[PDB]
Each structure stands twice: as C-alpha cells, then as structure tokens.
UniProtKB/Swiss-Prot annotation, chains A, B:
Residues 1-300 are cytoplasmic. Changing residue 132 to H: In strain: Omicron/BA.1, Omicron/BA.2, Omicron/BA.2.12.1, Omicron/BA.2.75, Omicron/BA.4, Omicron/BA.5, Omicron/BQ.1.1, Omicron/XBB.1.5, Omicron/EG.5.1. Changing residue 189 to A: Does not affect ability to cleave and inactivate human TRMT1. Residues 1-300 form the Peptidase C30 domain. The active site is at residues 41, 145. Inhibited by pyridone-containing alpha-ketoamides compounds 13a and 13b. In turn, alpha-ketoamide 13b (tert-butyl (1-((S)-1-(((S)-4-(benzylamino)-3,4-dioxo-1-((S)-2-oxopyrrolidin-3-yl)butan-2-yl)amino)-3-cyclopropyl-1-oxopropan-2-yl)-2-oxo-1,2-dihydropyridin-3-yl)carbamate) inhibits SARS-CoV-2 replication in human lung cells. Inhibited ex vivo by michael acceptor inhibitor N3. Inhibited ex vivo by compound 11a and 11b. It catalyses: TSAVLQ-|-SGFRK-NH2 and SGVTFQ-|-GKFKK the two peptides corresponding to the two self-cleavage sites of the SARS 3C-like proteinase are the two most reactive peptide substrates. The enzyme exhibits a strong preference for substrates containing Gln at P1 position and Leu at P2 position. 3CL-PRO exists as monomer and homodimer. Only the homodimer shows catalytic activity. Interacts with host FBXO22; this interaction promotes the proteasomal degradation of nsp5. This is 3C-like proteinase nsp5.
Length: 300, 300
C-alpha cells in the first residue's frame, strides 16, 4: 500500500476563505452562513501590537471600516463583534458554498489539515499535529493570519484552529473558532514561551503499527514490558506518559497486526535506549508522532 | 516562517473525480468536458491481469458496459476508445466543474500533488516526486487506481499522472493523461523491476537553501568545490549528476541567501561523507529530495 502524511481534501474549505482588510492590515477570514470569522488583530497596526487595548481599538471602528472581499465580490458588513480573540463580522449574504460544519476544540496530540492562505486565496494544504505545549510547527508567512485548520468526517467539516501568530522561537499559536487560544498565549507582540515540547507517545505507537502493516519490522524485538516501567523510560526521553485510555485506542491496530500494545511499547523502549542505528522506518530516520491511531486506520 | 511539505489545494480536482465500473471492477476516473479518462485495466478481471490482450477484451465491450457515476448521478456513454493505456469514455454531459486544464508529461525529479480516491470519492491529498527511475512512493489501496496527480498555476490545473499499479516491491507506477507509462512499465501483473532509485541532487540543494532561510545552518562549512569533483562524490552515494542547467535553476535561491551554488555543493559533500551525526535539518534526520527549487521559492 505505502504510507504518506495526508491532508483532507480542501475544496469544502476553499469555498469559505475570504480577505478581510481594516486599515492597511489585510488577512484571511472564514465565511460561514452570514458571518465572517477572523483574528481580532486585523484592527491593529504594527505599532499597536506591542500593547493593544482591543476594546478601545475596536470602539474606533464602525461596520464600514471592514472590507470583506470574496474573490471579486465585496460583502456588506451589517454587524461586528469580538468574541474572545476572534472578530465576528455579520454580513448581508449567506455563503452559498457553506458546507455542513461544526466548531470543535481539539486536544493536544490530535491532528488536522491546514489550508494556508494569502489575501483570502488558498495556496497550500498540509497535515499537522497540535503539540503537547499547544503550539504547531507550521508554514505561515505574513498575510497567512486567519488560515484555518479542520477535520472532515462524511461531508461535515469540523473547524478546530485559526492561525494568529508566530512566536519569537518560530513556532505557531492560534485559537479555536470561539477565539480561545490553545496554550497560555495572548495576541500581543511580547516575548512568550512555550513549555517543553514532548513527543506524542500514542501517535508513535500508531506509526509503528503502520510500519508493521507495510512490512517494516526489523524493530520488533523479543522483549515485553509494563505500562509503569515503560513510563519511567518515557520520562527520560520527553515522551508523554501513556495511559489505559491510550492502550484501548490502539486495540484495533493490536487486533489487526497480532501484536499486543505492551510488546510494541517494548520495541519503542529499545529504539529510545539504542536509537535507530542509521536504519529507517517507513522511509524516516526519526520516530514520527504526527499520525493518530484514527489516521492510521483511515489510511490502512 | 517554517517549512512543510505542502500539496496544492485540491478543490478544482475534487469536482472532476468520478467512479467507473465495468464488470465487478470499479475504479476512479477524471471527468473533463464530455470525456472520462480512466486506466484501461478497468476492463480486466483479476484473471485477465496475468496476460491481458487489451484489444480483444475491449472488443467484447460496448458503450453500455461502462457505468460512470458522478456522486449520485449517472452519465450516458456515447463513445469509447483506448489511447495507449487510458480509456477515453465520451459522455453526453460536459462537466460543469471542469477547470481550465492542460495535460503535461513531467520529467523525473519534478513534484506534484496526488488526490487519492476510492469509488470516485477523494479521501486524501499529498505532495510527492516522480523518482529518477520513474516510480513514485505513494499511498494507494485497492480502489485507488485512476487517482490523479496535478500541479496548479493561476487557476490552470496541469494534469501529469494517473495511478495504474503497485509493483511487487510496493512502489507505484502510472501514466500521463495520454496513457503513456512513465518508465518501462506495462499494465500487467508480472514481475517488473525499477532501476536503482537515485537521489534528486538539485532538490536536495533547494532544501538546504530553504534550511538556511529558516535559520538552520550548522551544516554550512568553510570549504568550496567544483562541479566535476562534486559529481565524483555524487556517483558514490547514488545522487543524480548535477549539470549547469541545475546550477542556473538555483540562481534565485543563491541570490537570496548570499551563498553560491558550489559552496552549497561543498556543504552537501561533507554531509554525504560524514553524515548528519545525529543532528537534524528542518526537523529531518535525512536529506529531503522532494522539493524542487520552484517549490522552495513558492513557499518562501
């Protein structure tokens, strides 16, 4: 079969991307029904971003200060509000290309597709993970702010992420579509720090199962181990602690491959303690943590 | 900014994917204007695939033997022909969602986006490279045959690849949209072999430039070298030989980073001769050859 990092098809979301301008500042928005969602920092200059009072900046703006452009065609703004760190611009027109959608706050370790945009135009799509420290490792130039992350199930799009900023360290922070940040981040240009980025253990195990399925299994060993003792090793290598929840989520992959979860944990232990020794697994010389168990099943 | 493997937005191509059935056999097709393009092996059983005479199999089939389904809606087949290894089914209806398009035969080392499908339904999109031996390393289950590869420029889609088969070794072969195979492959279930898979040198250099731009440059050395002497080292590590064409293509990246192409070739030489020594470049522990110079510019 083979094994690739794979985004959801982006066409349903392409139809919702718009440009929003307010002063010089232009960025991407999401047009769903008769509402445009965008980062509230569209109302800031570069000067304001050091110490913005978002109340007082927004109080200067009326409905006509916002220029929403959908391809060639401008929308009329008949209502604005701020919910947390998102701006909700009410427009005259319902989007004809609105898919079935929900807004979801995802958990760290979950994956999603990102459509990266510039002036309301999609340019690229990729699959990523929400890191344990609530950052993402993305591609976001200037003009990409308000680029969005999603999952697709049936023909329901679940919107989980809006891009707001690059932190001084070059990693990325953003909100849900209710405008709450993931992590402790704020929409201001100060020195903000993420915690230690750990590896998502359950995703690693999932990927090892994907490897076995595809015929890569040099890493399978004789040993087994315990949950308890696995976690001591996990602590030392900055792996997330594995729980019984995690074990249960791997059960289908366990069933398909004939390998018990603790036997796979023992394989991993030895890769942590000895390294990969120059060899590769599914064409990679590192342990990949950016596929959930669900993603491996979907693909397999 | 950051740096990801990034597919083109797939929405323009989603609108062209259909199911084609002929006997039991079902696979994906591409509906452009009033023509459906699909792999000619849709007319084969599993038995036929050992030694198919495609003339004689097709001669048994009339127009009504082909069941083209577009979502819920069936098309009427008013003409069939075989061009090389593709079947061209003429239909009654022009596709309303036909984008501006061309068919292009790409060269080895060029990249494209793939939309992987099942029964005329897109499920996933990823970026890949045509390898020097004309194979691709893909994700293709049963039912994915006639999944398509493309590039997008402006709003022109350039269709360059149709998936036909998995070779015994688990790599993938397919055609252009004129039905000529890339490589020496045939659409039959025999033991077929690809040549030695070499690394695409110019793509590696492009990626090193991407690394420099993003602030990863531990690998930059004091040395320089010659084209001639670089290639001797390239030969030993199964890298493609670098030409003056290649040097010229890197000139914009050279201009932006302030590093001459031969100085970068010298960096690479030392990574080949010494390895990466456990360190990473743009989060990778191997040298990536799946971004062209154009891709790095597009993204940067």
């Amino acid at each position: 079969s083979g094994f690739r990092k794979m985004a959801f098809p982006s066409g349903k979301v392409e139809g919702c991307m718009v440009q929003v301008t307010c002063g010089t500042t232009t960025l991407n928005g999401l047009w769903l029904d008769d509402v445009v969602y965008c980062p509230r920092h569209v109302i800031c200059t570069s000067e304001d971003m050091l110490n913005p009072n978002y109340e007082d900046l927004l109080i200067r703006k009326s409905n006509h200060n916002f220029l929403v452009q959908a391809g060639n065609v401008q929308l009329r703004v008949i209502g604005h509000s701020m919910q947390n760190c998102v701006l909700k611009l009410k427009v005259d027109t319902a989007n004809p290309k609105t898919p079935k959608y929900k807004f979801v706050r995802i958990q760290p370790g979950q994956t999603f597709s990102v459509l990266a945009c510039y002036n309301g135009s999609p340019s690229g799509v990729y699959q990523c993970a929400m890191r344990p420290n609530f950052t993402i490792k993305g591609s976001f130039l200037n003009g990409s702010c308000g680029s969005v992350g999603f999952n697709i199930d049936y023909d329901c799009v679940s919107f989980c992420y809006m891009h707001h900023m690059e932190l001084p360290t070059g990693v990325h922070a953003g909100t849900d579509l209710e405008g709450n940040f993931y992590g402790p981040f704020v929409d201001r240009q100060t020195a903000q720090a993420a915690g230690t980025d750990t590896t998502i253990t359950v995703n690693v195990l999932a990927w090892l199962y994907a490897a076995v399925i595809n015929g890569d299994r040099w890493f399978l060993n004789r040993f087994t181990t315990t949950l308890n003792d696995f976690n001591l090793v996990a602590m030392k290598y900055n792996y997330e602690p594995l729980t019984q929840d995690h074990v249960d989520i791997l059960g289908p992959l366990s069933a398909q491959t004939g390998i018990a979860v603790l036997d796979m944990c023992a394989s991993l232990k030895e890769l942590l303690q000895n390294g990969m020794n120059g060899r590769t697994i599914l064409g990679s010389a590192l342990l990949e943590d950016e596929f959930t168990p669900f993603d491996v099943v979907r693909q397999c």
